[model samples]
Target: GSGGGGGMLRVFILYAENVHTPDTDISDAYCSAVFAGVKKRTKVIKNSVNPVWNEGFEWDLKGIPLDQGSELHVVVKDHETMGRNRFLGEAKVPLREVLATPSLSASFNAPLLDTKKQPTGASLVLQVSYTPLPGAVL
Candidate 1:
């Protein structure tokens, strides 16, 4: 069955607001998204609490359903010149939301959470969509 197993997931990392950085008022911020073991990242914006990436990333979903407990993991980090980058916060979006939407795209204002799963008072704005492969039955 060619092109009949799964679909494609498209995620647009539009921008983030009020992202916090440890020990600083502003941060060199960037974002990353991981889904189904495929990872993609946006470019870094220097010295800002609110960064606009306007970046898009995609993943091919082969043999996986959107409702199969899949999640899109997004992380915001503060880039460092000489040291390892620092983690600011993260947001996880379940793929089922996209599947439940009648429209092609769904927007989200996902709250960023710290390592302890507590809110960091920051959020990431995203546009997500899913497209089934040709000849696929959903």
Candidate 2:
């Protein structure tokens, strides 16, 4: 077994639009920060990209662990600009469960695995429960 050292870890950020169509108020008035709590005695990693979310679907996340925690808290200020950079909208991400289980093999010629394992059996797993970290123009 590789001891899960080769499994890939990924992150995401998702949310719903406030109105369907963006408002005309594209000013320095929005602030977005993804508050993620790793889990009880757990750690949440931060990514180079915190998923600012473009005007697209799912707003797929390119997030890395921010820190370690049990509960995640995201704060979004729909003002257009958090401090300097203008923002479209903000989103919140949470970590519920994470797993990188490996495939079980009891083959007689297991040496074949070390030589050319297809890696078609094992899979990485991640589960998170969210309640939409609502946003406002604060």
Candidate 3:
């Protein structure tokens, strides 16, 4: 049986580099993160190929453990005023690495993948950490 425990997951969106913008030379870029039924977004950085968003978001896990195949999905998009936002690329970070150690904090240079699941020659840097609740079973 699965353990009746949970924890908190913290993720920091550090920056992005060389993001692909095929239609334009630069982009109004912003990032969104989805994890455990929670979603958060960063402020848009306009007119830049490389964007820096040092924003942090967190999720409180109530009943689910950290190693239960949880994944953090991040998507970078082009912010638009007149039309639909364009998909720049995305990354999926598995939380299993954080579960391998107690209260572990790690950084990842996650490569961005296109809608077709192909590399877009871009990467997003992130800092992630997980802290288990008191008396929680790992």
Candidate 4:
């Protein structure tokens, strides 16, 4: 969903480092991103606090207004043998910033918090960027 005209939101999930989890050891972790009604995940990295994916993910902004509601959801989680996935932390990136910049490819740290909003000493690292379409005036 893009508001500042029609453009493509491309997020490069470069990698993540120093991810912390309270339920298990700092290993067997992966990252997931939700955008444009799709959820994509990175491969599991074994016992890595500094895992790098360098994978590029994109979303189509055809009908969205590209405002505050246009947010990119990112998450880091620990793999489990059974039951639910163990959450490490999450962050939201506003499409507005990506759309406003001439070029953006920077790594950001997202804090992992619990239900109580307590910090877990964990952070998700990611790089983000966006490209506008032809005649899609913002």
Candidate 5:
């Protein structure tokens, strides 16, 4: 299932800045992403409102159903040594738009929204590229 219909969907989480949730403290802020069931986290940037994490992630899309809807889910949180982490902000990138575009290397800014569905005064700068399998179609 990893290699068939098309190539993997590649996403690069360049960096996130000014990400903060309402009424949340800013110490030990970090980001997490879920791409096609694969989860990854960035290094915690201690005591900074604007943190930069040049991270990259990708997922295979052979038999996966994209029709139901696919999205890049990113959430900022406070890194705690113990207990559950605190929520900061979130950014959801729908794959539809990225797939529609023909360009391979693309860069865009996604706004991080708070729980109220309002902008959390933060944004994520990401660079991504999509490539179909050598003889497959997406």
Candidate 6:
């Protein structure tokens, strides 16, 4: 259905330095996201499901569906969950992507800001939720 981390579904966590300090080029705090769905739920740290991940962000955010009816629950923590976390946001995603399926997603409020009375870098989380269309069992 979707690919980037997995052939089915994947969550991408991007991080860029934000808020500059006196002795630092950029000031970026660590950010983490927790993934949970119908089948499994784990922090982005250990059960990472992304593939060929290369960027300034961490490849520690992802969740794979277990069955045909399983879905994905995406959550972002201001610090880190399982140890530290903040109620950033939540999104329910389905295992499959079909026209009849109900697609859903959400964007986590980043840690940084932009120019014009803003910071710099930011973090966000996304997911998709939907139902598969009935088909013949042939």
Please report, in order, the local distance difference test score of every candidate based on alpha carbons.
Answer: 0.61, 0.24, 0.61, 0.54, 0.54, 0.32
List, residue by residue over 1-138, the lDDT tens digit for candidate 2.
111112122322232222223465454322222233221111225552533332111111123321223222222333211122332322222233321112210111111122244336542121232212221110
Best-fitting candidate, scored by lDDT? 3
lDDT of 4 by residue, 36-81 (tens): 4466665545665644653556666556544534556665333221
Residue 2's C-alpha lDDT in candidate 5?
32
lDDT of 1 by residue, 1-138 (tens): 132347788998776543447665655543556775666765555665544654677877667555535666665433211212333544556566776666646888775544565545655668788887763545
In candidate 5, clashing pairs total 0
Candidate 4 clash pair list = 2-66, 3-65, 3-66, 4-138, 18-49
lDDT of 3 by residue, 58-134 (tens): 77765766664666766543311121233344456667777675657777777554445554565566877887767
Candidate ranking under TM-score, highest first, comes to 3, 1, 5, 4, 6, 2
TM-score of 2: 0.23
Candidate with maximal TM-score: 3
lDDT of 4: 0.54
lDDT of 6 by residue, 23-123 (tens): 64533333323333222233446445553121122122233322344433333223221222232333333333422343422333333333342424434
RMSD of 1: 8.2
For model 6, the superposed segments whose C-alpha errors exceed 4 Å read: 1-7, 16-28, 37-138
- RMSD to true structure for each model, in Å: 8.2, 20.1, 8.1, 7.9, 8.0, 10.7
The residue ranges of model 2 lying beyond 4 angstroms of the native Cα positions read 1-10, 19-22, 26-31, 36-69, 74-94, 99-138
Worst 10 residues of 5 by lDDT: 78-87
lDDT of 5 at 115: 54
Model 3 CA deviation exceeding 4 Å by range: 1-3, 17-29, 42-54, 76-90, 113-122
Backbone collision count in every prediction? 0, 20, 0, 5, 0, 5
The 10-residue segment of model 3 with minimum total lDDT is: 78-87
Error in Å for residue 50 of model 3: 14
